Design a protein around this motif. Sequence first.
Motif, PDB file in Angstrom:
ATOM      1  N   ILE D  52       0.859  -1.177   0.000  1.00 26.19           N
ATOM      2  CA  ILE D  52       0.000   0.000   0.000  1.00 26.19           C
ATOM      3  C   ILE D  52       0.897   1.230   0.000  1.00 26.19           C
ATOM      4  O   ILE D  52       1.767   1.369   0.864  1.00 26.19           O
ATOM      5  CB  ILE D  52      -0.955   0.031   1.203  1.00 26.19           C
ATOM      6  CG1 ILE D  52      -1.788  -1.242   1.275  1.00 26.19           C
ATOM      7  CG2 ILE D  52      -1.870   1.216   1.101  1.00 26.19           C
ATOM      8  CD1 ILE D  52      -2.794  -1.229   2.382  1.00 26.19           C
ATOM      9  N   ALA D  55      -1.436   6.026   1.750  1.00 32.30           N
ATOM     10  CA  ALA D  55      -2.711   5.641   2.348  1.00 32.30           C
ATOM     11  C   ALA D  55      -3.101   6.662   3.408  1.00 32.30           C
ATOM     12  O   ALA D  55      -2.749   6.514   4.580  1.00 32.30           O
ATOM     13  CB  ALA D  55      -2.628   4.242   2.945  1.00 32.30           C
ATOM     14  N   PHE D  58      -7.198   5.761   5.966  1.00 35.91           N
ATOM     15  CA  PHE D  58      -7.333   4.358   5.602  1.00 35.91           C
ATOM     16  C   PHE D  58      -7.691   3.564   6.847  1.00 35.91           C
ATOM     17  O   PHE D  58      -7.048   3.719   7.887  1.00 35.91           O
ATOM     18  CB  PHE D  58      -6.028   3.851   4.996  1.00 35.91           C
ATOM     19  CG  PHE D  58      -6.162   2.593   4.197  1.00 35.91           C
ATOM     20  CD1 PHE D  58      -6.591   1.418   4.783  1.00 35.91           C
ATOM     21  CD2 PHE D  58      -5.821   2.577   2.860  1.00 35.91           C
ATOM     22  CE1 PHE D  58      -6.697   0.265   4.047  1.00 35.91           C
ATOM     23  CE2 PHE D  58      -5.927   1.424   2.122  1.00 35.91           C
ATOM     24  CZ  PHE D  58      -6.364   0.267   2.717  1.00 35.91           C
ATOM     25  N   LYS D  60      -8.231  -0.450   7.807  1.00 36.05           N
ATOM     26  CA  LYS D  60      -8.006  -1.802   7.307  1.00 36.05           C
ATOM     27  C   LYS D  60      -8.347  -2.780   8.422  1.00 36.05           C
ATOM     28  O   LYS D  60      -7.535  -3.014   9.319  1.00 36.05           O
ATOM     29  CB  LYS D  60      -6.567  -1.966   6.841  1.00 36.05           C
ATOM     30  CG  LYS D  60      -6.305  -3.213   6.044  1.00 36.05           C
ATOM     31  CD  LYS D  60      -4.946  -3.129   5.379  1.00 36.05           C
ATOM     32  CE  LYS D  60      -4.627  -4.391   4.608  1.00 36.05           C
ATOM     33  NZ  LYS D  60      -3.335  -4.273   3.881  1.00 36.05           N
ATOM     34  N   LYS D  61      -9.546  -3.351   8.363  1.00 33.25           N
ATOM     35  CA  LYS D  61     -10.014  -4.323   9.344  1.00 33.25           C
ATOM     36  C   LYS D  61     -10.151  -5.704   8.715  1.00 33.25           C
ATOM     37  O   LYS D  61     -11.120  -6.424   8.958  1.00 33.25           O
ATOM     38  CB  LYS D  61     -11.339  -3.885   9.959  1.00 33.25           C
ATOM     39  CG  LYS D  61     -11.225  -2.743  10.955  1.00 33.25           C
ATOM     40  CD  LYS D  61     -12.384  -2.764  11.940  1.00 33.25           C
ATOM     41  CE  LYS D  61     -12.626  -1.399  12.565  1.00 33.25           C
ATOM     42  NZ  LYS D  61     -11.636  -1.066  13.625  1.00 33.25           N
ATOM     43  N   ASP D  62      -9.179  -6.076   7.892  1.00 31.00           N
ATOM     44  CA  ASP D  62      -9.190  -7.354   7.191  1.00 31.00           C
ATOM     45  C   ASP D  62      -9.209  -8.529   8.164  1.00 31.00           C
ATOM     46  O   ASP D  62      -8.907  -8.376   9.346  1.00 31.00           O
ATOM     47  CB  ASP D  62      -7.973  -7.452   6.268  1.00 31.00           C
ATOM     48  CG  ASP D  62      -8.126  -8.520   5.205  1.00 31.00           C
ATOM     49  OD1 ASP D  62      -8.583  -9.636   5.527  1.00 31.00           O
ATOM     50  OD2 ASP D  62      -7.785  -8.237   4.039  1.00 31.00           O
TER      51      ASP D  62
ATOM     52  N   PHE E  58      -3.957   6.094   9.515  1.00 30.25           N
ATOM     53  CA  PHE E  58      -4.112   4.687   9.174  1.00 30.25           C
ATOM     54  C   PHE E  58      -4.484   3.920  10.431  1.00 30.25           C
ATOM     55  O   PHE E  58      -3.840   4.084  11.470  1.00 30.25           O
ATOM     56  CB  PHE E  58      -2.813   4.151   8.579  1.00 30.25           C
ATOM     57  CG  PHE E  58      -2.964   2.882   7.802  1.00 30.25           C
ATOM     58  CD1 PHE E  58      -3.411   1.724   8.408  1.00 30.25           C
ATOM     59  CD2 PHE E  58      -2.621   2.838   6.466  1.00 30.25           C
ATOM     60  CE1 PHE E  58      -3.532   0.559   7.691  1.00 30.25           C
ATOM     61  CE2 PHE E  58      -2.743   1.674   5.748  1.00 30.25           C
ATOM     62  CZ  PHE E  58      -3.197   0.534   6.362  1.00 30.25           C
ATOM     63  N   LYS E  60      -5.082  -0.069  11.460  1.00 27.74           N
ATOM     64  CA  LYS E  60      -4.876  -1.432  10.983  1.00 27.74           C
ATOM     65  C   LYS E  60      -5.233  -2.386  12.114  1.00 27.74           C
ATOM     66  O   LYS E  60      -4.426  -2.617  13.016  1.00 27.74           O
ATOM     67  CB  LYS E  60      -3.439  -1.625  10.523  1.00 27.74           C
ATOM     68  CG  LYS E  60      -3.193  -2.889   9.748  1.00 27.74           C
ATOM     69  CD  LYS E  60      -1.832  -2.836   9.084  1.00 27.74           C
ATOM     70  CE  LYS E  60      -1.530  -4.115   8.335  1.00 27.74           C
ATOM     71  NZ  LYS E  60      -0.235  -4.029   7.609  1.00 27.74           N
ATOM     72  N   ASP E  62      -6.112  -5.678  11.639  1.00 29.15           N
ATOM     73  CA  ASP E  62      -6.140  -6.968  10.960  1.00 29.15           C
ATOM     74  C   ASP E  62      -6.178  -8.126  11.953  1.00 29.15           C
ATOM     75  O   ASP E  62      -5.874  -7.957  13.132  1.00 29.15           O
ATOM     76  CB  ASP E  62      -4.922  -7.099  10.041  1.00 29.15           C
ATOM     77  CG  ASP E  62      -5.089  -8.183   8.997  1.00 29.15           C
ATOM     78  OD1 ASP E  62      -5.563  -9.286   9.337  1.00 29.15           O
ATOM     79  OD2 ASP E  62      -4.743  -7.925   7.826  1.00 29.15           O
TER      80      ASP E  62
ATOM     81  N   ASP F  62      -2.994  -5.251  15.376  1.00 29.84           N
ATOM     82  CA  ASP F  62      -3.038  -6.551  14.719  1.00 29.84           C
ATOM     83  C   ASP F  62      -3.093  -7.692  15.730  1.00 29.84           C
ATOM     84  O   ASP F  62      -2.790  -7.507  16.907  1.00 29.84           O
ATOM     85  CB  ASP F  62      -1.821  -6.713  13.805  1.00 29.84           C
ATOM     86  CG  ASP F  62      -2.000  -7.812  12.777  1.00 29.84           C
ATOM     87  OD1 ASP F  62      -2.489  -8.903  13.135  1.00 29.84           O
ATOM     88  OD2 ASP F  62      -1.648  -7.578  11.603  1.00 29.84           O
TER      89      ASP F  62
END
Lengths: 62, 62, 62, 62, 62, 62
Positions: D52, D55, D58, D60-62, E58, E60, E62, F62
């Motif tokens: 990425i 960003a 952004f 991102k909660k994948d 950002f 994150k 994940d 994470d």
Amino acid sequence: VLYVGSKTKEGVVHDVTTVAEKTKEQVTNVGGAVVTGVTAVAQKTVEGAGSIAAATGFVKKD
Amino acid sequence: VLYVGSKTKEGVVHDVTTVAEKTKEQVTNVGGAVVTGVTAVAQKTVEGAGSIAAATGFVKKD
Amino acid sequence: VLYVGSKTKEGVVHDVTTVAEKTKEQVTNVGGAVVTGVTAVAQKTVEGAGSIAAATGFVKKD
Amino acid sequence: VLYVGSKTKEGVVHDVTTVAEKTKEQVTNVGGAVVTGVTAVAQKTVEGAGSIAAATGFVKKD
Amino acid sequence: VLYVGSKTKEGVVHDVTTVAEKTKEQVTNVGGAVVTGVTAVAQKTVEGAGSIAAATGFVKKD
Amino acid sequence: VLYVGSKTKEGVVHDVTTVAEKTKEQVTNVGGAVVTGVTAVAQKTVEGAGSIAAATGFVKKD
């Protein structure tokens, strides 16, 4: 005249707020009378013949 | 005249607030009378013939 | 005149606040009368013929 | 690649002027990503799988 | 790559002027990522799988 | 790579001027990442898998 418990205000000027931000000015006077600021005149009595009271921006070429 | 418990204000000027921020000025006077600032005149009585009281920005070429 | 418990204010100027920040000025006077600052005149009585009281920015070429 | 007298500008950000006067703001973020200021990202090359680049704002909660 | 007299600018950020006058702000962040200021990121190359370059604001999870 | 008379600028940040006058701010952060100031990151190369370069206002749970 006789006052009894009289919160009198007679011949008074107050609370004249004046803000100015980023203001240009430019005067080119020749013998005249330019007035640009704040003028707060407060009187109570003016006597006399031919007198003048509170004369802002006055040109007298009699 | 006779006062009894009289919170009088007579011939008074007050609370004349004046802010100015980032203000340019420029005067080019020749024999005139330019006035640009704050003027707070407070009187009570002015007598006399031909007198002048509170004369801001005055040009007298009689 | 006779006062009894009289919180009088007569012929008074007060609380004339004046702020100025980052302000340029420029005067080029020739024989005139430029006035730019703060003027706080407080009187009570002025007598006389032809007198002048509180004369700011005054040019007299009689 | 071969340059000869080449006034090149490649992958560049400039002259991003931003004025703001008397502006209120108020953010109440909860786990998100609020972005309110100036962001000037300048790159030339980014390799890689799943990468990425640049960003802003952004989540991102994948 | 071979340069000869090359006034090159590659991967550059400049001249990011930012004025602010009399501006209120207020943030109430809870676990997020609030960004409000100036961010000037300049890179030339970023390699790698799954990498992240220039990640402002950002989140994150994940 | 071979340079000959090359006034190169590569991976550079400059001339980031930032004025602020009479500005209030207020942050109430709880576990997040609030960023409010000036950030000038300049790099040339970043390698690696899963790396992160230039991470302002970043929250990684994470």
